[PDB]
Design a protein around this nucleic acid. Sequence first.
RNA 1: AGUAUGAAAAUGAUUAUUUUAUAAGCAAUCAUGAAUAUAUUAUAUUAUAUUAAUGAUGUACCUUUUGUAUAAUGGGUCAGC
RNA 2: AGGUAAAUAAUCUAAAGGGAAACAGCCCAGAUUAAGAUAUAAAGUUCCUAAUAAAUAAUAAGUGAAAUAAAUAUUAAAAU
RNA 3: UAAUAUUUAAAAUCAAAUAUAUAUAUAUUUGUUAAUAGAUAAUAUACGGAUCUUAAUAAUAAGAAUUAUUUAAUUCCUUGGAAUAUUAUAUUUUAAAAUAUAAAUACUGAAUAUCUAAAUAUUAUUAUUACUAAUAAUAAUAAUAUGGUAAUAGAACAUUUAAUGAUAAUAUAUAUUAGUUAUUAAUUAAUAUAUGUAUUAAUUAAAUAGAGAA
Lengths: 138, 176, 148, 118, 34, 118
Amino acid sequence: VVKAIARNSIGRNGVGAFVFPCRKITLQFCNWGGSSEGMRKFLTSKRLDKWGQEFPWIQFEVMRKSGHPLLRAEYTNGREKVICVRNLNIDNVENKLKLLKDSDGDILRRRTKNDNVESLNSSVRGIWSPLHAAKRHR
Amino acid sequence: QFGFPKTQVTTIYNKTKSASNYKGYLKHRDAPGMYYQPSESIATGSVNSETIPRSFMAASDPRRGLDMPVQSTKAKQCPNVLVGKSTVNGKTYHLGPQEIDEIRKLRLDNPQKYTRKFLAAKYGISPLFVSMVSKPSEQHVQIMESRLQEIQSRWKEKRRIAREDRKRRKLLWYQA
Amino acid sequence: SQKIGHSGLAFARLWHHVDVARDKRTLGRLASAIAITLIGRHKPVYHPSQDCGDYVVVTNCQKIRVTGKKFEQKTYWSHSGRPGQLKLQTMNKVVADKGFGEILKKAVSGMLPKNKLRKQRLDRLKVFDGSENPYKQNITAFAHEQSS
Amino acid sequence: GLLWKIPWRMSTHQKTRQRERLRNVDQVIKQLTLGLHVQRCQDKGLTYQEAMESKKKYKPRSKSLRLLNKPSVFPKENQMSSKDKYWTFDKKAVGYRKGIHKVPKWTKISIRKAPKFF
Amino acid sequence: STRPFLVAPSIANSITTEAPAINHSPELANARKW
Amino acid sequence: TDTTPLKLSNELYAIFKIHNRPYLVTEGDRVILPFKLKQAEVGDILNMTDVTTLGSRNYKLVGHPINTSLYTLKATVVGKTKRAFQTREVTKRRNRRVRHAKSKGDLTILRISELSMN
RNA sequence: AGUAUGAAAAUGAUUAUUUUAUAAGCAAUCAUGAAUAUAUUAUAUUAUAUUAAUGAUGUACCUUUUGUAUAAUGGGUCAGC
RNA sequence: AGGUAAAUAAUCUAAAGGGAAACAGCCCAGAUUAAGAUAUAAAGUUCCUAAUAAAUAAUAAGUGAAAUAAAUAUUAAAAU
RNA sequence: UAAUAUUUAAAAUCAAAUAUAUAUAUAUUUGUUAAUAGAUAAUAUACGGAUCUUAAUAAUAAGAAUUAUUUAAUUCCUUGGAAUAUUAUAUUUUAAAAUAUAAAUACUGAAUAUCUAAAUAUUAUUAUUACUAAUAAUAAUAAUAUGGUAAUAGAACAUUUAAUGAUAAUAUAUAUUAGUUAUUAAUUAAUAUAUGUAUUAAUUAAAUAGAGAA
Ligand SMILES: [Mg+2]
Ligand SMILES: [Mg+2]
Ligand SMILES: [Mg+2]
Ligand SMILES: [Mg+2]
Ligand SMILES: [Mg+2]
Ligand SMILES: [Mg+2]
Ligand SMILES: [Mg+2]
Ligand SMILES: [Mg+2]
Ligand SMILES: [Mg+2]
Ligand SMILES: [Mg+2]
Ligand SMILES: [Mg+2]
Ligand SMILES: [Mg+2]
Ligand SMILES: [Mg+2]
Ligand SMILES: [Mg+2]
Ligand SMILES: [Mg+2]
Ligand SMILES: [Mg+2]
Ligand SMILES: [Mg+2]
Ligand SMILES: [Mg+2]
Ligand SMILES: [Mg+2]
Ligand SMILES: [Mg+2]
């Protein structure tokens, strides 16, 4: 007899199509507040428009709130990076935005030495066996 | 066939003393071309095409003609393991219908006197076959069940756990 | 990728057998060789945070080869905590007392990494002065080797 | 007093390293000389390849280089004796000799010609 | 009525040898005792 | 070079080298390069023009950049994110000042989309 | 030594998770299994957090000194000054 | 004298890293932050412990194997 | 060739090699003993330890881990080539023989150098953005530099007060936990407690302005 034990498929973002990881970016600023001056300038300066033109798969919200200025960004996986751009200037804000866009939403994490690849595919060659070795031990 | 050079997964370092060291392998480099590297590994969980036997490929698949599910071991030498007596000496269909009926009747009548083993002995036939043929009186079965239950009850804590573990292991070992 | 798969066979402890009658390596060398096996350095799946070494059965340890005058002159030491209780025994004396197996074992112990695992690894090594032993059945043996 | 555990001999590996170093020094000198020769050739009126080919290669004029070239003053490694590759003349040792590896920065310092009889 | 058993060549061909007298054996100790 | 048994297999691995760093991958894997790419952006695709070794269970083609004609191995860039922030504390042994040495290196993440014989 | 408030720490008891009765040293760092907890994108072959399997590395801090693991100075811990 | 007084150079002082078992001052090498593919330094390559294979001789003392103990005596070996 | 009495030498002599005219001469360079005893004290043997010196009969197999002189298979000619040998593999042929291929770049080894990215400063080239534009901000390319006590120089942050000052219980302040930004700081989300709400953002001015060291 053969019985099936249930399972589900794992998504590999880039193998078929590629969904773009960043989805929404919210430029948050304040009219009053010297910390939010750079942000304001950025908003003014057609740079935002240019960015929009470049990257239409990602939407730019523009909120008005009383605190420090922010760039909260929302990703496919669900997670949300948030960068407070306190007291930055236009270029720095732009750089921050770029950084946000580039990243996948995934959490930061310490890598060990040489941990490069991350597969969910069973080894093409088998896992070594002492009995199926080409050279026996002694 | 293919006339490729064959190689071990080589290390520039001493394999006996330092096989786990990745760096050595990395350092090693071999002359450009094709190579035959037999997998240093069993093919139990695998579904690789170079693992499937020729008999299970369709009569059309080009891989049939090629030579990479190698028959390294030879069946002459390997001892039969946990095999039934019918396999060593072919199956027999000697037993008729009347005989079968008689056997069934016997089973119905007295299971403790005419147990499966006894039946087998009588009719030169497997206990399994007997079982297949004939159901014993349900009372007997019930009694057996009760006995089993009692035995289980008599177990200590540790033993039960062990049994459970064993069961789990068994379950696992049909996954592959 | 490569590490993924059924890895049960890799980390299986094989029993190896060394017949010291049929091995021409001298004591120390042999011990060193055994040490590697015990550690599990011979296998590519070894990682230092893991005891994964095999079992070694040594048999006919009475015919081990020792060079020079070491049999007479090589002195094994043991100290209790108590001053004046230094025991110094020559190799031959030790052999007479316990056996050649003991000698071999000591060497292996010396070879091995000095940590928790050590003792286990040492105990994995089973030594017998003569031929007979209780592990004859469980030494690793292939089906194609059965010509003899 | 304070334990400076430095042996009186050198290990084979050390010796080999020393030899290699010596060879390298010689090579540097050789290269310099070659360069000078080719410069001379170019000045005279030849190509690089031609200069390289030339049978009559020019010796160097500068004093130091000339001295280096002389095997009496500055031996090459194959010429040099075992006793001078791995020992120096110490004026206050027993046997008037001392392992080179004892000399302060022996890996940088060059020192070939010990005294004639010492 | 045989069972699936194998055997290593190293252990089959190993010539028979008797283990010598260990002093820390009980038997030997018995001899020693007064 | 007879490349039929690689062609016929279903499972296949490759050992491509980016800046001489070898990564061994199958299709669907995520390679974490320990640096920031400027050539490629997010969503771009890289055709690997240096692949040391292609391999099946039992056969393996090898060579210093083996012909791009033989295979198609192409990875898409998914992410440019940094590895987690750390402050390793630097100081000597009787000196009160400390130098906080911060570290938040950058990663490029690829996904091996195609890995096939051509 | 005003009145409210007080999840500030040191300190005590207790419960949970986890590790621990063949193991030896600034008690951390790095590697690395296993167990548990949480998570409204764990789709999982998931992610984080906790935790002295196991391995490697690792002479507290200040002061003063030519020079300190020093068996040289100074400090019981925390809070305020 | 791990003494003392000056001379020259280096290092330590104020210098982490590799080696010298452990090590201020020796041998190499100067840590902006990572990463770890390629050259390597001094040192090493049976195991502990990262890495090894050869050639020609000599030694039989465990001499010796990272800290060389003297006169002298004995025995052998070559050369004249 | 035996016995005989010294010496432990490449100075002389001989041999070999390199450079000058060159089958010779000249000049330079290198090549000449080993064991044992003598030997030795107090917590414990003390190469760091294990241990290391090899052997027919037999191992798809060990043969110094010491001392001296070397090499990176061995030999020749001038990094190279050739031959020889060895090992491994493949193919053919009858466990051998023939053919072809590969290996001969020993390896480890640092926080050294390079590569690979990131930061800062300077020098020299750029590109984008904005009306000392010969500027600033950001981004490139090449280069050089970035250990540090005493010490000098430059730049920031926290806390509190004064000047100016929107806003709001969906707000704020403080706390805990998990995130985020090259992070003594701030910010995001959830949670708990206040409070009809900032001496709040920012620029100045100042300080009872930062504590494991008395
Ligand atoms: Mg090793
Ligand atoms: Mg010292
Ligand atoms: Mg100091
Ligand atoms: Mg400090
Ligand atoms: Mg110290
Ligand atoms: Mg005190
Ligand atoms: Mg003094
Ligand atoms: Mg001072
Ligand atoms: Mg230092
Ligand atoms: Mg200095
Ligand atoms: Mg520096
Ligand atoms: Mg000794
Ligand atoms: Mg000594
Ligand atoms: Mg002693
Ligand atoms: Mg040693
Ligand atoms: Mg550097
Ligand atoms: Mg500095
Ligand atoms: Mg104060
Ligand atoms: Mg305080
Ligand atoms: Mg402090």
